[PDB]
Specification:
Oligomer: part of a larger assembly
Number of strands of chain A: 0
Subunit structure (chains A, B): Homotetramer. Interacts (via N-terminus and C-terminus domains) with TCAF1; the interaction stimulates TRPM8 channel activity. Interacts (via N-terminus and C-terminus domains) with TCAF2; the interaction inhibits TRPM8 channel activity.
Structural class of chain A: mainly alpha
Protein name (chains A, B): Transient receptor potential cation channel subfamily M member 8
Order of helices and strands of chain A: H
Subcellular location (chains A, B): Cell membrane; Membrane raft
Family (chains A, B): Belongs to the transient receptor (TC 1.A.4) family. LTrpC subfamily. TRPM8 sub-subfamily.
Chain lengths: 34, 34
């Protein structure tokens, strides 16, 4: 049983968590400046 | 031997490095404002 969907999928999930970390950083700066 | 997984994969790696550069910029601004 072999597939290449889950490896790109796991890439998508880890970049999604990176983007959410970046969103948390942006909302941190949004709370700090205001 | 032909595949299209590695070209989209290399796109994913170069955008991941772009995102990490953006994270370094955000942490630079996070260090500068504070």
């Amino acid at each position: 049983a072999n597939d290449n969907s889950e490896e790109m999928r796991h890439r998508f999930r880890q970049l999604d968590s990176k983007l959410n970390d970046l969103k948390s950083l942006l909302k941190e700066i949004a709370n700090n400046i205001k």
